[PDB]
Amino acid sequence: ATKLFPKFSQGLAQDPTTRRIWFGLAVAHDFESHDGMTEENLYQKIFASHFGQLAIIFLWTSGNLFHVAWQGNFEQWGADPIHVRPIAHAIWDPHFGQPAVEAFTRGGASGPVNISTSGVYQWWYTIGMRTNQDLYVGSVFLALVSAIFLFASWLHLQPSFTPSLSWFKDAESRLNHHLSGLFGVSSLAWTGHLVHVAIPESRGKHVGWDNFLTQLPHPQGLTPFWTGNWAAYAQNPDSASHVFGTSDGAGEAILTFLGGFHPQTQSLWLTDMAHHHLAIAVIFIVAGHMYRTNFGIGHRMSAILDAHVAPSGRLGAGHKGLFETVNNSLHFQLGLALASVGTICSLVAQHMYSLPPYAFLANDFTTQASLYTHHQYIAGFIMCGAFAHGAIFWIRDYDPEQNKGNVLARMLDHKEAIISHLSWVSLFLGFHTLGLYVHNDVMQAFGTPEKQILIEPVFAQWIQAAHGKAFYGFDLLLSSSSSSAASASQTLWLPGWLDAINNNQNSLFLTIGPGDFLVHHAIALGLHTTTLILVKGALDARGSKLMPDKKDFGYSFPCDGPGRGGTCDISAYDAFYLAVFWMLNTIGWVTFYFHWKHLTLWQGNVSQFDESSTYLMGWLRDYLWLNSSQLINGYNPFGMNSLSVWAWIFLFGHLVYATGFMFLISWRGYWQELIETLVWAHEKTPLANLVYWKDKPVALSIVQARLVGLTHFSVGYVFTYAAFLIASTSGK
């Protein structure tokens, strides 16, 4: 009879098959579809759900601090961060054999433990933490914060504390508060930590909760700030002879603009990081005082959007009629948020390898590699969600009559132009980028390396020379001291930026060769193609010659039948499903280029990359095959070492990846009929016929199997690489 599992979906609740259990977990956080859903209730539910996610994040962080403190080597690693290996947690495996118990005792422990690649150690050291107590206190604090958010999820869901839809649609104020309070007052507050705790701790001086109200951050005090002589805070910077966590070479500056990196830590200076947060905090607070609130002075967002219509009428009604579109659509906003967060997630990876922001971060190669790959992959999934929710906006929440002539409606007008032009660029990048790899491979095979085509990335080399790179010899801007920009900065960060950029032992603007030219264009191909797939699905989300009523069929529908030749994978969910593969392929190439460019940098054999990368055969034998030699030997017929888990995961990843294929290659039908035979056998089998199924066994849904196979496929690509990226970098 009817079940209760799918409370939100009565159809699933009445479903006699097992699909009700599977879909009940999927259609669970799609409230917009829940039976009896009001816009205000939807916002209130989402608002509370946000608190829940914030409780998990803080609880997750507290756990890391707790395990690092209870089962870690922080104090030992802090004493010698270039020899001690940060310990993440202990391995209590009731299955471990004695050799496993021995081999996994590393980083200075009395039992099997796991070295950490998250880089929390380097970060917590740089910010002021020095003992295990600092970690315990922080974990308790964050745990309390998690408890508070959890109560708030309850409080904001109980009548009288449930915000009205109007409050949820109060944009002008929300943006003002978030920009000034959430972004600004949280950056100045951070400068307050740095100036008061981090900088003193780096100069060897405990300024904790016991003596912070009595310890002057600057010798002069707030006097220079009040007198306006702000410069006093930028005098006596820490000398190059300074040692992090020691008064050796320690200076007195609190806010400066030295640039480059501390000599010993090889990471951005703290003072330069203090002044950064102070400067950005000021901008955020002032920017917060822009939109109108309940006082008067201010800007109404609607007016700005409507007042921006090109007089030539090239953009039609311009942004007029767009404020309601964004304010009344929670998919449009989510798409913009995912796009913004995704892009910034990549900036963190591209700016944290070049400029290590934490002490002794560069030294830890395995951490650096596993942190770049983490963010670059997370960023890619976020970007797929951006376009995904954008397509949902086109169908679930787009009013074609209100948006009439607006920049958003004149996009579908030239939808073919946008889609077709993205096709030409993808083909051009594909036909050529690959052709100049096969051409080089042929020359390598025929022993004619000189004949291989090696185009020079001159355009990038000039942007490098502009920043001050001299190797190329172009004498442009910063490269030329007699310049205006070079002379202007000569008294600020310039003296340092050059010293650091013109040092080949780090990753600030690394020398690029013709090998980088090909891979960079290959990355572009992935960016354009993945984009084309998502863009095509978004534009054709509610329209198409094959399926002109796609909006009536919703977002996630298997197909429109075998009619009109084939409607297989015609839903805008299947532009996402397919784009995911290209996203993984694109990120795969970028995280493989990072790893090789850097493994060759760290091993000292830069010529290895500068030559093998030119042809694809080098990428496989010199990179994947050569580095995999150790990982695969984690456990052999002669014994096992500490890399056994990674070898096991490496194979485990392949298994999950291959399993994903069956759900994608095979389709619903052979399995369904097979399940029918299984149902017959059980009903006929004696002693087993007694036990029976409450839900009728049915094969996975057409769309369901698409996501199940894709999850297996993705999980594999992640575990298989995470294993390589960590066991090949650590093994050396």
Binding site: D15, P16, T17, P548, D549, G563
Partner: protein, 80 residues
């Protein structure tokens, strides 16, 4: 159960009816076509969502539309 709807763009060809595998469609009399017939969907409780009728609709786009929705033993065609 799947939702089957017959739009005014029907020519009363009866092809969709002679195509339904579970007797879900029938031909009722109408006046907007020269064949004085318009397919109706009396028993959409037996619709499996095969969409065979659509593959048999000759009118521009589709006069008959099957919107796959809730799934039951009949809708899933389960003999279990």
């Amino acid at each position: 159960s799947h939702i089957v709807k017959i739009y005014d763009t029907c020519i009363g060809c009866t092809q969709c009816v002679r195509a339904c595998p579970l007797d879900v469609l029938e031909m009722v009399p109408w006046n907007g076509c020269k064949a004085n017939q318009m397919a109706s969907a009396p028993r959409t409780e037996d619709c499996v969502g095969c969409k065979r009728c659509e593959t048999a609709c000759p009118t521009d786009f589709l006069s008959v539309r099957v919107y796959l929705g809730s799934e039951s033993t009949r809708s899933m065609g389960l003999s279990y």
